[PDB]
Every structure is written in C-alpha cells, then in structure tokens.
Amino acid sequence: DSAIGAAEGCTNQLDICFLIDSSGSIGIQNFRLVKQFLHTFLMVLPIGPEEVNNAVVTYSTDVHLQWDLQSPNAVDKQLAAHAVLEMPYKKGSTNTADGLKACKQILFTGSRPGREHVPKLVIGMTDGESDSDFRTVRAAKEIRELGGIVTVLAVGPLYLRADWGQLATAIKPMLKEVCKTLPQDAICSDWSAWSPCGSQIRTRTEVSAPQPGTPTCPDCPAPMGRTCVEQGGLEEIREC
Numbered sequence: 001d002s003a004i005g006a007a008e009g010c011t012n013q014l015d016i017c018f019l020i021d022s023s024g025s026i027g028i029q030n031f032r033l034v035k036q037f038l039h040t041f042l043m044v045l046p047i048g049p050e051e052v053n054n055a056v057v058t059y060s061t062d063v064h065l066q067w068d069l070q071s072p073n074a075v076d077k078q079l080a081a082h083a084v085l086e087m088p089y090k091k092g093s094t095n096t097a098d099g100l101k102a103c104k105q106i107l108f109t110g111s112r113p114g115r116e117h118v119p120k121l122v123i124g125m126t127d128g129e130s131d132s133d134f135r136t137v138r139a140a141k142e143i144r145e146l147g148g149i150v151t152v153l154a155v156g157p158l159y160l161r162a163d164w165g166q167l168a169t170a171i172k173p174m175l176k177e178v179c180k181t182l183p184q185d186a187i188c189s190d191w192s193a194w195s196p197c198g199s200q201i202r203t204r205t206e207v208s209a210p211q212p213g214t215p216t217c218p219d220c221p222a223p224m225g226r227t228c229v230e231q232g233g234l235e236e237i238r239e240c
C-alpha cells in the first residue's frame with residue numbers, strides 16, 4: 001500500500017520542496033499541464049503529519065513562495081492537491097538560483113518542530129533553459145552536502161527527461177529513482193501486550209539496523225534514516 005515509502009525500501013518521513021519554473025519560456029498553455037502534473041503527484045505521495053511534508057515554490061524573475069512546511073497544506077494531501085490547482089502564472093526571466101536558495105531555507109531552516117533532520121528533497125521542474133543550473137548554483141551544492149536530495153525534470157540519473165504529453169508517465173520512475181537515494185528506517189517488531197497495574201507499559205524490539213541511502217555527491221554525507229528509538233522508542237508508557 002505504498003509507492004515511495006514504507007516497506008518498498010525507503011522511509012516515510014521526508015520533506016519536499018517543489019521548485020517550479022514559471023518563466024515565459026514554458027508558456028501559459030504548458031503551465032496548466034504542470035499543475036495537473038503536480039495534482040496527481042501529491043495524490044500518490046503519503047502526505048501526513050508524521051509521514052511526508054511538502055513545500056511548493058514557484059519562480060520566474062523573482063521567487064514566489066506558495067507555502068512552506070509550517071503551512072497547513074504541508075501535512076494535508078487534499079488541501080495541497082487543491083491548492084496547486086490555484087497557482088498563478090508570472091512571466092519574466094528564469095531565476096533558478098534564488099529558487100534553490102529558497103528551497104534550501106524551507107527544508108533546512110523552515111522544518112516543522114518535530115522533524116528538522118529528516119531526509120530533504122528538492123523536486124525541480126525546468127524547460128529547455130537552466131539544464132546545468134541544478135548543478136551550477138551553489139545552493140544545489142550546499143543542499144546535497146547536508147543530506148539533501150535534488151531531483152530535476154526537464155521538459156521539451158536524478159535528471160529525468162519528459163515531454164508535455166507524457167508528463168504523468170515521468171512520475172512512476174521518478175519516485176522509483178528517488179527511493180534508491182533514500183534511506184530505510186529500522187524495522188521495529190510489533191508491540192507487546194499491555195502490562196497490568198500503577199501505570200501500563202508496552203514494549204517492542206529493533207530487528208534490523210537502519211539502511212542509509214546512496215550519497216548524492218562525492219565525499220558528502222548521506223541521509224541514514226531513523227532507529228527504533230527515534231520512531232517512538234522501544235517502550236511506550238500509559239497510566240491505569
């Protein structure tokens with residue numbers, strides 16, 4: 001019952017900064033298909049408060065933040081999916097640099113109070129322009145060496161090519177290619193039966209170690225997922 005999380009081979013706890021190009025080089029016609037692309041995209045992702053959080057930033061000449069991680073859209077699937085359909089279009093140049101600078105801020109400095117250290121991910125979307133900007137911009141460099149991940153989709157390995165018509169076809173292998181880079185959290189055993197009274201304590205045990213994912217850049221840290229003590233602890237306590 002998953003696609004990019006849980007048992008498949010990668011963690012549910014994950015933050016995403018969607019960086020969408022809104023320059024004049026895409027046109028407004030194709031931009032509508034982009035919103036349709038993101039709509040069905042968020043439908044797939046297990047977006048929850050303790051699962052996947054999302055953040056969307058559009059950019060053209062300047063940077064236009066839609067909502068960060070502390071936004072109610074970040075934790076609700078139906079809200080975010082509805083919100084992406086209502087995003088405006090602003091012509092102009094192509095400022096990917098400050099766009100990645102914006103995503104870096106939301107992910108590493110703008111996380112929800114519980115999970116700052118969870119695997120960060122940038123899912124960018126560009127056209128025929130700025131093919132190298134997702135490798136050139138210093139922000140892209142700084143994200144990867146913090147345990148962050150950058151994904152690129154050019155229209156017209158983490159680099160994916162697609163056409164305007166077959167946009168939705170790119171979703172399936174993208175989440176597949178991402179799950180390789182992602183780590184896997186520790187496999188915890190099922191909970192034990194509740195103790196009598198006084199208070200009531202239930203316990204579980206860690207089965208296998210957290211499998212760290214594949215590092216993004218040469219000689220730079222990789223996300224390593226969370227142990228069972230980081231998933232809620234081996235023991236939970238209730239009163240009676």
Ligand SMILES: *[C@H]1O[C@H](CO)[C@@H](O)[C@H](O)[C@@H]1O
Pocket residue numbers: 189190191
């Ligand atoms: C123990 O805790 C709950 C049971 O209510 C579930 O999240 C799961 O079954 C786990 O093993």
